[PDB]
Amino acid sequence: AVPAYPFSLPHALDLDPHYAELRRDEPVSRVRLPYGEGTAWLVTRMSDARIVLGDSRFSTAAATDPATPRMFPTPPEPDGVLAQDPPDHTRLRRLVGKAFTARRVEEMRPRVRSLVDSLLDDMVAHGSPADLVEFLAVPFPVAVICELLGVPLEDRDLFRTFSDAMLSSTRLTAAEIQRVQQDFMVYMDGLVAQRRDAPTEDLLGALALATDNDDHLTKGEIVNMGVSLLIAGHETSVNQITNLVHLLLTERKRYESLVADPALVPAAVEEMLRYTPLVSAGSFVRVATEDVELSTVTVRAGEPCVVHFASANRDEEVFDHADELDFHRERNPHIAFGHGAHHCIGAQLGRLELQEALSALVRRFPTLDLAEPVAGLKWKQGMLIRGLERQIVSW
């Protein structure tokens, strides 16, 4: 009876035109998600998005029930941050949030700028043409989160594999993913356990203290924070570097406009954050705990809702010429980093990383162009997020 969401297999970074139709004439529409049972409201507009994400009457904890609609094979892990409601959620985030403040993240620009340069030095050693993914997109975020978290850099292939499986949408089965979660939890649990009598000066260390020094928080929750930070810490930024670079080079003018004014980069990062559907479709589901008014509908208590971040970021009531990509927007109140209690904790880290990668490239490689055809570009399929597996560039 009700439409299947996602509405189509994704292509590149392009939005299904049905989102625009929905925004205009049915901003809160009912849908059938690929897993779980029953039905959920899809929220396509910014005003409503902020209510689902921002309001205390929406619970993510309530979506841990296997019967709830969701975008992924496995029932959500109860111990994950996305599934915690405040105040427990607040305490959990407090454990680690100090290190992610705008101010602390800013402290890293120097380590991060060196790291980027070093990895771009190794790209020039190789010489054009080269795979931007191989040389920059993967190794840069991976190094940063490894050094931040205190995760062995030699284990990249291990945690990348794990992380890719947990961000599966259509690709893997419930059992394959459920398998990987236990391995990953055991891996992380072993990693924090190494600090029982070898305390470290890193997040995993702080995480280890919390497991032997906390009454409010379970060990499952504390350990799962480590896996959430490690998955997110690289999966987002790695794909997001390729996404911005794709958007820049497909219409060379954009890349050209940044070479002209490298101070634009930060605003262009914020723009491309708004434009890009990093989350391919949907979001972690929020279940209403009381009736809640949206634009066109009152969501009833127990009814699930899901948000498409990218569609809210194409809302014509809040962005002028929203279907157009523009680095000179005066205001840009996007929700590329979500909104409310679960606003991404690495928003400042992601920004730092994207700024520094894009700056360095725009300074150093003015003659950067896509050295493979747009048609054969290998976008990743059946994962909850989008990005390229390779990006061969010439200079």
Ligand X SMILES: CC[C@H]1OC(=O)[C@H](C)[C@@H](O)[C@H](C)[C@@H](O)[C@@H](C)C[C@@H](C)C(=O)[C@H](C)[C@@H](O)[C@H]1C
Active-site positions? 232, 235, 237, 344, 353
Task: Pick one of ligand HEM, ligand X, none as the site partner of residue 365 (Cβ within 5 to 8 A by kind).
Answer: none
According to the binding rule CB under 6 A, does residue 348 interact with ligand HEM? no
Residues 67-126 that bind ligand HEM (CB under 6 A): 81-82, 93
- β-pairing, 304-307 vs 40-43, is parallel
The dihedral built from the CA positions of residue 6, 172, 131 and 140, taken in this order, carries a sign that is positive
Neighbouring-strand partners of residue 392:
131
Query: Which tokens in the block code for residue 118?
Result: 């070093």
Q: For ligand X, which residue of 64, 283, 311, 348 counts as binding (CB under 6 A)?
A: 283
Question: Interface with ligand X includes 247 (CB under 6 A)?
Answer: no
Q: How far is the CB of 234 from ligand HEM (least distance, A)?
A: 8
Please tell me what DSSP assigns to residue 186: H
Asked if 345 touches ligand X (CB under 6 A), the answer is no
How many Cβ atoms from other residues are within 10 Å of residue 163's Cβ? 20
Separation of alpha carbons 32 and 3, rounded Å? 6
Residues 290-309 that bind ligand HEM (CB under 6 A): 309
- Residue 10 phi/psi, 5° resolution? -75, 150
Among 236, 311, 313, 355, binds ligand X (CB under 6 A): 236
Measured from the CB atom, is 45 or 234 closer to ligand X? 234
Asked if 222 and 94 touch (Cβ cutoff 8 Å), the reply is no
Taking only Cα atoms into account, the Rg of the chain, rounded to an integer number of angstroms, comes to: 21
Assigned token pair, 165:
């499986």
Query: Is 344 labelled as part of a ligand binding site?
Result: yes
346 part of the interface to ligand HEM, by CB under 6 A: yes
From 232, 245, 272, 273, residue interacting with ligand X (rule: CB under 6 A): 232
Rounded CA-CA distance 203/219 in Å is 15
**Residues near ligand HEM, by CB under 6 A:** 81-82, 93, 145, 228-229, 232-233, 236-237, 240, 273, 278-279, 283-284, 309, 336-338, 342, 344-346, 349-350, 354
Give the residue numbers of the binding site for heme b: 89, 93, 284, 286, 342, 344
